[PDB]
Design a protein around this ligand. Structure first.
Ligand SMILES: [Zn+2]
Ligand SMILES: [Zn+2]
Ligand SMILES: [Zn+2]
Ligand SMILES: [Zn+2]
Lengths: 223, 223, 223, 223
């Protein structure tokens, strides 16, 4: 019912292993169609090497119910849905356990902006959420994961439109963008600055965050 | 005599270099057939690029004697055999010297669970064995290596069915699963969490193990 | 108007992703033609996988105006131009955000010469610039970036002909050479010594710079 | 005049980039023919992608003079020659600047045996030479590099037949074996244990060298 969207989401998902952001069947990408009040997401239980546009699943933003698709949607669907509802500006969402972004997530630390590479895509510190409560973990887990992300941005006054990424404590990264492709790009850059962030810290443990002026020059220039 | 099993084991072995879990001729995979009281394992002295299903060797679980095969079985056969005998639930075993899991093994330290990636495959700390005694090293080495692994799980009260992996002090990782393929997957994830475990420790040297609730949510959800 | 030069610059740019010096669309290479008072540089907004020799842009060294080309030149053109004007000897320039060189840049530290690998291409410490002032960042940024590089070499008395590389604080590496190809080679070696520099420091935090005699033997031997 | 040897040496050299032991034109492999009193080595100034068996150069062990070949021999020829003369048992030599072995070399530290991976190929600590004197550096450099290696093994009482590798302070690794292929294998394993050696140290800074019994079990088993 949204063949082109399914194609985009299919290609985005296929891009995950190509850019070494994932292994086995981890990761998932989705793209939204606000007008139709629905979003397309990777299916659960399908290898990337067999995946076809038909395997993509269409889900209702409002009810989280599957509108079209023979396969079961990704188990992360609730988190995606919550995010689309909470952040109006986003059009695509990417979830992976890319090694270095995940390393920061497991360490429960935020990735500070120390380079223009980072400044070009994330306006400031890429936030890491607080740990989830037992109530949250044992309740509607995936949906609750989404709430913890939204809470992180709200309590810290950060605009989801200027920070297309977040690290979920002890879990991994979540990125988003204008569309499926854009989200994938932010996901790869997120992994990139996560990697460089580890070693530049090692070289300079007391390195201060980059100059606000430089951060502004780069982020505001684009966007 | 077990053509399909030989095919599975052949493919599993071939997967080792594809996933960069090994170099040269290191590593070996085997799968069991309880009813026939036998297991199929990689041959010793054969490059992965020349290996064929016929090269796989069939070995008796009870006697450790070669039941069928023109080639010599992997020198690690005794360890595999011991493990099949000791852990009834396992159907496949993988041994590699994958860089990061091996780094932990040489450091003689256990990989703590600090992420959901880990929680999805290993129910808790991936154990590292104690050093082997000179008696053990100079006796039936490979067989004794198997005993040290079993002893590790017993003295620490860990269920082999919930912890499909172990690190042998100063040597390398050993993984297992329901079958050849499943064992290979656990082997690759083991390497993965080993890698992330190194750097998340660097970022947070005092990082506590992940929340028991989160560990439970993830491991118990599957399995 | 300089088909062969465009070919060289096209190939050089295409080499960036091949040698894993870049991702997405980052990076850019240019080569000069002193006699014609012009230089050819990568275009802005074109994927490496679609790039053709026609996409290359010809720019005036003196006016920085586009002499030929349907596409917009790289946003880094001003930095390139400034460098060609300031350093007469250079014939090619490469800019990338290659992970390890960039790690040093974000750490704001210079890469010391600790190996003959380094000695063969850089005569001494590969300099990292000071931070740029707000005036510089908010003025003609790219052009000013070039000035900060030149100032670095002048105040430190380093000959651009013996040090084909520099790290721009919080940004990334810039390399150059006799031509497009030569610059690319220096860029890859720069990344290489940046990588080894990180870990040899970890192994030996108090390691002194390599023997001046060894540095001289290697650099002076070639060049 | 030794077509088969030239083929072997050609393939060995070509293996260097395949196993990521080198970049650009670094590295070189040679194999000897004691009876003919000559050795075949990679040529200087030829890309790996263009190299053919004819490009290999034949050199006299006794005079170091080129016996056959249109191209100039590797600038490292003297070091190779010296080594063949000093160590009768070796039949092949490999020199590379493989990242991790080179990291140890630049740090001027020896790689301790902490794993069976290492034990299978190197009987003990892989030695790193002392720094070379100015007299040595400014004299017959390459030949002198060979002398420093031999001196290292002699003063430390280490048998070249049991330690197919060495690190030259501030330079890089040198490996050898029964033949070209065997030397290449030792070179790749040397890089491997160098890599793991870096991080297992990070995990366990006070980790003692592996048990002598385990080292013996593994090295003596083979060889
Ligand atoms: Zn996840
Ligand atoms: Zn082993
Ligand atoms: Zn840049
Ligand atoms: Zn060298």
């Amino acid at each position: 019912m949204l063949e082109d969207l399914k194609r985009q989401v299919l290609e985005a998902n296929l891009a995950l292993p190509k850019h070494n952001l994932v292994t086995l069947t981890w990761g998932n990408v989705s793209a939204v169609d606000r007008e139709r009040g629905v979003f397309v997401i990777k299916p659960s239980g399908v290898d990337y090497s067999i995946m076809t546009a038909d395997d993509m699943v269409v889900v209702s933003i409002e009810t989280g119910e599957v509108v079209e698709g023979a396969k079961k949607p990704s188990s992360d669907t609730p988190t995606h849905r919550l995010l689309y509802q909470a952040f109006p500006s986003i059009g695509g969402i990417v979830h992976t356990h890319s090694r270095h972004a995940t390393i920061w997530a497991q360490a429960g630390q935020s990735i500070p902006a120390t380079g223009t590479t980072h400044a070009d895509y994330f306006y400031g510190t890429i936030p890491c959420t607080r740990k989830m409560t037992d109530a949250e973990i044992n309740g509607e887990y995936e949906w609750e994961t989404g709430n913890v992300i939204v809470e992180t941005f709200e309590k810290q006054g950060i605009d989801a439109a200027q920070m297309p990424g977040v690290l979920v404590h002890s879990h991994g990264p979540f990125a988003w963008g204008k569309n499926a492709e854009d989200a994938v790009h932010n996901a790869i850059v997120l992994e990139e600055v996560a990697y460089m962030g580890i070693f530049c810290r090692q070289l300079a443990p007391q390195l201060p965050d980059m100059q606000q002026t430089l951060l502004n020059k780069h982020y505001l220039r684009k966007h």
